[PDB]
C-alpha cells in the first residue's frame, strides 16, 4: 500500500460512482483524518489495510496505524495556508489570517474559508509547511458562510 507522506483523498464506492467523503494527512507512517469523515471505519490503500489506532468523537479526530503525530500549533499572529483538496479538483493552497473560537475551555484558531463537505480533513499549515491542524469542524454564521476550527490532536 501507499505510505508516502502527503495529503490524501478519502473515497467510497458505496454511493453513485466514486464519492470523496474527506481528506487526510499521511505523516510518519500514520494517517490522520477527522472522525466524521470515516466514522472510525477501516481504510484501504491499494491492497493494504489501514486499521484505526486512536479516535475521539469530541475532538473529531482519528489516526490510523499509530498514534497522532501532528503537534505543531498556530502561533496566534501569522497567516496560515489551507491546503484544500476539494472533490474532483486539484490540491489548492489558500492563504488566510485565522480568526478565533473563544470557548469556556480556551481560545482556538479558526479559518473563514468555505468548501464542500468532502473537503473535511484538509491540512492547515504554518510558514514551515508544518501541519498545525485539520479543516472541517466548525460553525455557520448569519451570512451563511462557514468558519472551521483549526483542530489539532489534544
Amino acid at each position: 500500500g501507499e505510505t508516502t507522506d502527503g495529503v490524501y483523498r478519502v473515497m467510497t464506492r458505496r454511493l453513485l460512482g466514486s464519492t470523496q467523503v474527506g481528506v487526510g494527512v499521511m505523516q510518519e507512517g500514520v494517517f490522520h483524518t477527522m472522525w466524521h469523515v470515516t466514522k472510525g471505519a477501516a481504510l484501504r490503500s491499494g491492497e493494504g489495510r489501514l486499521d484505526p489506532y486512536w479516535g475521539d468523537v469530541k475532538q473529531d479526530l482519528v489516526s490510523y496505524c499509530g498514534p497522532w503525530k501532528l503537534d505543531a500549533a498556530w502561533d496566534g499572529l501569522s497567516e496560515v495556508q489551507l491546503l484544500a483538496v476539494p472533490p474532483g479538483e486539484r490540491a489548492k493552497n489558500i492563504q488566510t489570517l485565522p480568526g478565533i473560537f473563544k470557548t469556556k475551555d480556551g481560545d482556538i484558531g479558526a479559518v473563514a474559508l468555505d468548501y464542500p463537505a468532502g473537503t473535511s480533513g484538509s491540512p492547515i499549515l504554518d510558514k514551515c509547511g508544518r501541519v498545525i491542524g485539520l479543516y472541517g469542524n466548525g460553525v455557520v454564521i448569519k451570512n451563511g458562510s462557514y468558519v472551521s476550527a483549526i483542530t489539532q490532536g489534544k
Binding site: V7, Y8, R13, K58, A91, L97, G99, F101, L113, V139
Partner: protein, 39 residues
C-alpha cells in the same frame, strides 16, 4: 468500504491566493463534537 488516493505534497506555496476574514466568535463544543454559536 473506504479507500485513499494521494493528492499532493504538504508544502507552503509562496504567493498563493490570499482570501478570508478573521472573525472572533464565542462558541460552545458539545459532547458530540459539534460547535455552536453563543450570543
Amino acid at each position: 468500504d473506504m479507500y485513499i488516493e494521494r493528492a499532493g505534497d504538504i508544502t507552503w506555496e509562496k504567493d498563493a491566493e490570499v482570501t478570508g476574514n478573521s472573525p472572533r466568535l464565542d462558541v460552545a463544543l458539545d459532547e458530540s463534537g459539534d460547535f455552536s454559536l453563543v450570543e
